[PDB]
Amino acid sequence: DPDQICIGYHANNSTEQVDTIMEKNVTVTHAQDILEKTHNGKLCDLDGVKPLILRDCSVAGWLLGNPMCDEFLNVPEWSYIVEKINPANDLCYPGNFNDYEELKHLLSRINHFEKIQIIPKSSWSDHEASGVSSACPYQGRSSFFRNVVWLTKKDNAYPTIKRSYNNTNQEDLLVLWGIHHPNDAAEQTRLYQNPTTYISVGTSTLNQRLVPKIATRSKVNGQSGRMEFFWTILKPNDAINFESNGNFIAPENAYKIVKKGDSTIMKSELEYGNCNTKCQTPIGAINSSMPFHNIHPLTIGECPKYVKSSRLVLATGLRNSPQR
């Protein structure tokens, strides 16, 4: 019965496992998971600011004002933009948006537009401004883009247009306009009278002169004609000058860039989730204090760091071997 002192270490009922280089599944007394693996599956407000959910509209359909996209005529400030992979409501009248991807890039740094009328539809005296197409229906009637104007001849005449707009606002202005590419020579004269036409556009930096391209093309949304759209950023105190004797899709409304900051165009099929988050991904929001996550590489907000790992666990305690 002599007295004794022993040296030992803690054990418990933990079944937590960690990996090392030389062994896997080592049971430890304590461990710390450092990987967030769950999300709420929703699109939420970011730090109290609601996203712009484009629903069935594309960026092009919104900005040009496809009639199907009237929900988005005057959107409020946003935190990020959500777009579907293939939005149904794009360019109702078939064609293309020149430098479309660069334009979308600019959007990733914009939080709020203020749309303003720059050239009133009423102001066209010597031209018809009511051009419509069945490619752009609204309430079952042929209509047109809301923000630009289809000008055609009046009294078998299309006099040369000379119109200027001076940006007297303190903000940069996004201006949109287009050109119509007709089907044939007869269509050209039927719409615009003049057989040979152009649009010239000038600012302090822009030097554009466009000529319509007549070509035989496949029907798209019921039309073989095409519209090609252009954009520019008009600086405060600079003016834009349009000249045309036909095929001109005139600006009506332009966009003041009123708020700039962090934004992104997120590709997602999800709808609005009536929720708030600090960290958003295209497949759901993250509410976590973990340093890492494996939800999705594309995030915005105050987020954990993304890794492709299925599991990340640090040993904190010691090798768990209770006696028996």
Binding site: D3, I5, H10, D19, I21, E101, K305, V313, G317, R319
Partner: protein, 163 residues
């Protein structure tokens, strides 16, 4: 493990010691019980906590993928973009997984070393005054009361007094 103590010459851990990571079991005429060594436990807690923080903080400036869009005739740069983003994601996934593996190994060995060092601390204190059983226990030649046991744990055991 590397230092031979944990699951080594000390066969197993103590579920009865809920006090800390490393410590003592004594048995004398007054009774028996466990007591955690506060010094080695705290030092280990600090070391491990600092490690967890260090791992988190170094990863701080990780790559952040950004959505970029390309048209049908920009397929080369689209591919370059994708391989670039995938490339950085793979690099940072590797960095995280490897660091955790390597540090988990070091953490387990750190505990093993601390246990061995605690054992040696007692061994070098007691010297000839106790028998080394080889299983982590010491059998005293003299009587060692609760105050005597406390001095061994304190690191103030008085060798000449009992020799």
């Amino acid at each position: 493990g590397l230092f031979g103590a944990i699951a080594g010459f000390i066969e197993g851990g103590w579920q009865g010691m809920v006090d800390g990571w490393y410590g003592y079991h004594h048995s004398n005429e007054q009774g028996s019980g466990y007591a955690a060594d506060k010094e080695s436990t705290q030092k280990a807690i600090d070391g491990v906590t600092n490690k967890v923080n260090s791992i988190i903080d170094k990863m701080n400036t990780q790559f952040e993928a950004v959505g970029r869009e390309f048209n049908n005739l920009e397929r080369r740069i689209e591919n370059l973009n994708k391989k670039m983003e995938d490339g950085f994601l793979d690099v940072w996934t590797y960095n995280a997984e490897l660091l955790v593996l390597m540090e988990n190994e070091r953490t387990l060995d750190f505990h093993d070393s601390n246990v061995k060092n605690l054992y040696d601390k007692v061994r070098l204190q007691l010297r000839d005054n106790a028998k080394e059983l080889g299983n982590g226990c010491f059998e005293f030649y003299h009587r060692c009361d609760n105050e005597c046991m406390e001095s061994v744990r304190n690191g103030t055991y008085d060798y000449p007094q009992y020799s």
